[PDB]
Ligand binder design. Sequence first.
Ligand SMILES: CC[C@H]1C(=O)Nc2ccc(F)cc2N1C(=O)OC(C)C
Lengths: 536, 409
Amino acid sequence: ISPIETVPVKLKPGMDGPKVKQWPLTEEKIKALVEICTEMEKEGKISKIGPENPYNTPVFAIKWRKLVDFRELNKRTQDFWEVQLGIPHPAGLKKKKSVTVLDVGDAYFSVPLDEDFRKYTAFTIPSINNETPGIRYQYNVLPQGWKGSPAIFQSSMTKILEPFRKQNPDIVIYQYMDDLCVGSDLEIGQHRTKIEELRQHLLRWGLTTPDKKHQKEPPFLWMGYELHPDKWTVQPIVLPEKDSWTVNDIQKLVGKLNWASQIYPGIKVRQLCKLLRGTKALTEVIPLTEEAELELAENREILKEPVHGVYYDPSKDLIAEIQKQGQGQWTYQIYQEPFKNLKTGKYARMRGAHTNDVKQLTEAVQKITTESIVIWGKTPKFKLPIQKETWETWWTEYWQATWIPEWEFVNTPPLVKLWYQLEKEPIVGAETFYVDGAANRETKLGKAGYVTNRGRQKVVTLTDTTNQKTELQAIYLALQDSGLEVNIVTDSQYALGIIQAQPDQSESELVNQIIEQLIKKEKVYLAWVPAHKGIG
Amino acid sequence: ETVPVKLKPGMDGPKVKQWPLTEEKIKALVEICTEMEKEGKISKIGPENPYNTPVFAIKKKDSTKWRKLVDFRELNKRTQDFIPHPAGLKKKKSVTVLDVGDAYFSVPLDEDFRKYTAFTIPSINNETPGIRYQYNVLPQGWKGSPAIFQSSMTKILEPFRKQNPDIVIYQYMDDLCVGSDLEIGQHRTKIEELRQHLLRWELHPDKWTVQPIVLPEKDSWTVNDIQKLVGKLNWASQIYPGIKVRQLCKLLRGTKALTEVIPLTEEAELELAENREILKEPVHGVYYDPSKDLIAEIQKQGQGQWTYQIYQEPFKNLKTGKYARMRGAHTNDVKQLTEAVQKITTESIVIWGKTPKFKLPIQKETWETWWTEYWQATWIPEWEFVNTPPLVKLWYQLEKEPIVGAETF
Ligand SMILES: CC[C@H]1C(=O)Nc2ccc(F)cc2N1C(=O)OC(C)C
């Protein structure tokens, strides 16, 4: 019946075909369906069956249109490779003299189904006299909404396009969903001609496409962007305008803005997000504060501006430049020619238990690198706000293996630097503070203090504290009460980690206070010693 | 003719994702695969096959051409079970490794098992669906390939073995390790002789052991000096219970300046002496257990230096050592680490005959996006990413080094 070879399909091991009862349907709904299945049978899409067929699926009606529910069949159907969920990004596309888009929607139903598996798709047309035997059928082609259809259809398209592609090297085809997107750098007449050749080639296999009178118009709306065959733009983003905002409204908005932060610089949600505190219900009406009214306002302005883009030229350099927009926050733009970006983005404030700015820069760099490999199969040359000396100093001695691909320095404030650097050896002439902190773990009552070789001492009692905290507070006190250079001895295990990693940011607000003190000193030497020893 | 290989009971085939590759690597893999399919070694597949094994391309030891490397680790683990280790290979003045992974394409793979060898050449920007294949012939890097061909491999080895019995020949996956005491030239001339036999169808184990730890020795010691010493020794007592810091700590009482000089008690004096002696030899009673996994932990020491320990039980090392980066690896922590893992896995194989599981002081993402760029072996070991404990590093930093070094006028 059909030219294309079928793909052998199976039900997950052990499981069996669907057995769902057919809902009762009104008389006009049954008629509509009775007619659609007379035509579908005629066209060859389905076959009249009804004897030894146990399986069944519910048919529906939404001129009427039928809808079969294969959720159950899908639950019983084997697994397939996967119909890739990773779709291309405009930044990776190439500028083409011509691009045509062929909707191959009905091509779905033009691909045969493993006859061996067709029994499973059986469904039934109800009756008025609920009693009478229903009209039974089954599918001969890939059912709309069935599990295997996307995968099998595309595999089929792949084998059918093989020859054409071989005979036409200068032509790029992209298949996705039920859309063939054909592009090239041939003269428009020659391109139009080759499209027609492709259409008749597909048609030779039973696949239909709309004529030149029906094919879709470039610019094409494709997942947020507007594609022109010579550049791309961003479909303008529209922010509502209401007198009453509910939590849903505010979360939806914050959602939209956050997506825009990527392409647009300066979008902010801090004040809008504040509206979400202690909210008791989704439908709750929160009034915008002045600042949220304002913030909302400036964002509307920013989004008015048109953000255009450019395509990828493989004969040109790929460059990535990075900015630290605030602590933990990073912005980047990848381009080829100065000021003509291919892509831009930012990474949400990276927050953790303890790290440093240089380490974070390093991570931003690798996220970019993974994204670039995917988009361009190449790695950008990097222009980073950090001096070579700074990198060489930090990396060369950090405890963890780290790297940054070829890069060059770009002096664009604020630069990424080392906020402090613990001394390598004890400091001659600096007061030496022996610190200690202890707390009852259960009563959460403790004491933190020190004694210095110069005779300075202090102790403070704390309540609702932990042991870890008294120890760290001991260190905090020493830093507060000492001169510009200080030596500090501690048996705290967490200080041992500070010595190794020398973090400039942390979760612990106490550690953060210590860090601020550490940064303030001219010289600090931190020394760890085993606890409960004959030391101190 | 094919032996019916099967999966370990209750196990399914590998469904591992293909990581993204550079453009260069993709072009290369496509060629390589077009050729293999011509030659009937692999065949394109349908979507009804849901299994996958990552694949990638390398350029091992000098080569203006790419080699295809497949990561069958997962598949190997799910594959059923089926020669022991030449205890003396470890004792040969010199070993040389050979890539005999080509022998395998000379044999067909059980029909019903090929589905599990499915792999996918990715496409740039997803502008195209991956190119899927599966093997028809025994694939390089799979654990069954060296077994199912043992028969034919041994067969081709006898005449050479039974010709030199002053040479040990050991096999592991795609490789063959051979060691002899003959001088350098002879060794190689004999190696080539072996390869010639093969065509018809640089290690020196005299260096490896557990390394000696050496405590500082000093004119005068400061409070800080003793403090550091004391913390290292206290940690080390988890290995040698006879190590003690009682006398040293008594010198650490009172609040003296970190830089003040302290005179060592005649007792503390002996204590340091007794300690130095205990550390003169590897701890007693450590033996390899063939039934337990072998562990390999690495620490980054800085300035291109790396220390490692191989053990099965905590603090009971089978071997320990140092690794200094090679030439032109100066700016690449990832290159250095990679190189070290290959060198450590190789010794691991030359000694116990299996690969160890590595504990790596690197962030997972850093390792995953760049390790293949510098890999050169046919095998791939297991690994986990860890945080190095400050003291573990400070301790092994202490191992003794050559007086001058290893001469080579
Ligand atoms: C086939 C040509 C291919 C390409 O290289 N550049 C462009 C440029 C403009 C377009 F509108 C489409 C595409 N192309 C493409 O595959 O786009 C799909 C993801 C929509």
